[PDB]
Design a protein around this ligand. Structure first.
Ligand SMILES: O=c1[nH]nc2ccc(Sc3ccc(Cl)cc3)nn12
Length: 344
């Protein structure tokens, strides 16, 4: 139980219910690497939907019941056997308690039952960490899974700009977006776009500036889709996405005859197509909801290369492709579990 909770010293940066947000930290004094991980957990988009979430998913809306510690697992593990990539890094787990896909900048008030401050929570964690050793960092990897993976896409460049404006131009900010790369496709049987559109207005949600300027007012929901926001980002971003992500299939109302076979095959081809120009990516042909903080994250391979290896090769690439150390790993086989290493 190695990461210790710190509630934000600025108690106006809050979870949905106005309780302070926070972060769990395990320092590694011999390391200049900092991993800041954004938890996932869907979102809520109106009063009634958020009230339901408050009643049975309250830890995603409040710090009142958070434990004093958490164990780092997967990419957050400090054990080299569990985490071949960054086991010696400074580890930060940022709980998701804003229900806004990390996009919000609005406080609870006379007109607002809930605060949606996800974008501000990230900025305040970064600011408070600077006084705890982050000022000496050489790399800050903003990582996250599911809603946190989209959160990386929406926030990595803002963290980079924040550090520049605060006077730390030597810290290299990079992103690792896990399971946050979705398609705004047609459902198999009869929506995120409408829910996200309503969510953005409810949250005062913010998207990266260059993407905002492309899509313009009322169309900021486009920037929640990885394939549309990624080309606009300046920071290096590594994308991890199952070709048959369970959340993608769930929203597509997929739960096998020809029509469904063709639908599933076309989904994997579309996902693969969106990753063609993403040079740092890991996209196995699996049906899964598993994420990079699971202890056995080491086990999956694409073309014989694991994700910890691909991430290490990415680090090397950011020091021409490297002999034997690839960074673009997208399965080409067309059906779930055509890769033998998919999670069981
Ligand atoms: O918590 C989990 N498990 N699986 C998922 C999938 C999406 C999300 S948020 C989200 C929703 C829509 C979009 Cl376009 C981007 C992010 N959260 N999540």
């Amino acid at each position: 139980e190695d990461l210790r909770l710190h509630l934000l010293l600025n108690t106006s940066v809050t979870c949905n219910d106005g309780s302070p947000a926070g972060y769990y930290l395990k320092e590694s004094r011999g390391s200049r690497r900092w991993l800041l991980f954004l938890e996932g957990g869907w979102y809520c988009f109106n009063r009634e939907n958020c009230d339901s979430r408050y009643d049975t998913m309250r830890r995603l809306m409040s710090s009142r019941d958070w434990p004093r510690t958490r164990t780092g697992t997967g990419i957050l593990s400090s054990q080299p056997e569990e985490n071949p990539y960054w086991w010696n890094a400074n580890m930060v787990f940022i709980p998701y308690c804003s229900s806004d896909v990390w996009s919000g900048a609005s406080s609870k008030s006379e007109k607002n039952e809930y605060a949606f401050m996800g974008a501000l929570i990230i900025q305040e964690v970064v600011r408070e960490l600077l006084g705890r050793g982050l000022s000496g960092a050489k790399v800050l990897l903003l990582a996250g899974s599911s809603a946190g993976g989209t959160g990386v896409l929406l926030n990595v460049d803002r963290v980079a700009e924040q550090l520049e404006k605060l006077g730390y131009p030597a810290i290299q900010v990079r992103g690792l977006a896990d399971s946050g790369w979705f398609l705004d496709n047609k459902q198999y049987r009869h929506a995120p776009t409408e829910a996200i559109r309503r969510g953005i207005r409810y949250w005062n949600g913010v998207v990266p500036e260059r993407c905002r300027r492309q899509f313009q007012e009322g169309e900021e929901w486009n920037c929640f889709f990885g394939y549309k926001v990624y080309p606009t980002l300046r920071s290096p971003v590594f994308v991890v996405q199952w070709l048959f992500d369970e959340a993608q299939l769930t929203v597509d109302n997929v739960h096998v005859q020809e029509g469904l076979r063709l639908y599933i095959q076309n989904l994997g081809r579309e996902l693969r197509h969106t990753l063609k120009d993403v040079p740092a990516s890991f996209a196995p042909a699996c049906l899964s909801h598993e994420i990079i903080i699971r202890s056995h994250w080491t086990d999956v391979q694409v073309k014989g290369t694991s994700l910890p290896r691909a991430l290490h090769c990415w680090d090397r690439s950011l020091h021409t492709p490297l002999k034997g150390c690839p960074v673009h790993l997208v399965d080409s086989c067309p059906w779930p579990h055509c890769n033998p290493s998919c999670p069981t």
